Amino acid sequence: KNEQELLELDKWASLW
């Protein structure tokens, strides 16, 4: 996976 998709996953996860 593009590491920026991972950065986008971390961003949404933090909203928890």
């Epitope: 593009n2 590491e3 920026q4 991972l6 950065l7 996953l9 971390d10 933090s14």
Partner: antibody
């Protein structure tokens, strides 16, 4: 040999616009996000946000969601930061920086992943004065 | 937002001395993605340490990091003349994710 080349210094009047560029070299522009960091004269670093070089989607820091716009041009492997309705407070050095986000595990988290800016552009001075 | 307190703003040490810079966070430091940066006059910031203690490529071996509880620490085992500079800690974290920098610590030559 990884390098970010930023455009030259800019002199603008209050209310004008500026558009600064940052062109990648020695790496795939779309493989790494780019952060935009401002440093006002005699002040510390301020994160303006980041641009996903794979999708073009911009994330703006809390205080820069209005007059600041991040854009892309993957053809020239370059990213852009446009400030609108400039204010003397916008007077600062604007830096482009390659984000590195990697680690171990299915999901990224601070215990297993690293976030850091390894390559920085030399900076683009923007002086806003009437 | 998380606030990273770097104290003192000015750290006075002699060249050759061992230097430790503190980044004290308003919450647990390892709950974010950490890094130390160095900035010299007229230059871009330069990455030194990422995470708690991983040394970036090309960075001298005198630089090391440690993090426990609310304290993130950069150690310079022997200050060289080019090490007198401003140092910024980083915390990328928080619920609205945010890249937070400390206010910066200038390491100045004590004479």
């Amino acid at each position: 040999q990884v390098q970010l080349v930023q455009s030259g210094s800019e002199l603008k009047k209050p209310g004008a616009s500026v558009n600064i560029s940052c062109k990648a070299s020695g790496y795939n522009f779309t493989s790494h996000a780019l952060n935009w960091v401002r440093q006002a004269p005699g002040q510390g670093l301020d994160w303006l946000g980041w641009i996903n070089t794979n999708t073009g989607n911009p994330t703006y820091a809390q205080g820069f969601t209005g007059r600041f716009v991040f854009s892309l041009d993957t053809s020239v492997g370059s990213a852009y930061l446009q400030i609108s309705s400039l204010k003397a407070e916008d007077s600062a050095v604007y830096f482009c920086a390659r984000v590195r986000f990697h680690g171990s595990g299915s999901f990224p988290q601070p215990a297993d992943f690293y976030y850091y800016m390894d390559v920085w552009g030399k900076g683009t001075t923007v002086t806003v004065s009437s | 937002e998380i606030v990273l307190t770097q104290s003192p703003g000015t750290l006075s040490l002699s060249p050759g001395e061992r230097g430790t810079l503190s980044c004290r966070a308003s919450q647990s430091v390892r709950g974010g993605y950490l890094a130390w940066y160095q900035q010299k006059p007229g230059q871009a910031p330069r990455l030194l340490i990422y995470g708690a203690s991983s040394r970036a490529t090309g960075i001298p071996d005198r630089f090391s990091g440690s993090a426990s509880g609310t304290d993130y620490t950069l150690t310079i085992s022997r200050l060289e003349p080019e090490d007198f500079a401003v140092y910024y800690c980083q915390f990328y974290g928080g619920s609205p994710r945010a890249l937070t920098f400390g206010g910066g610590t200038k390491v100045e030559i004590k004479r």
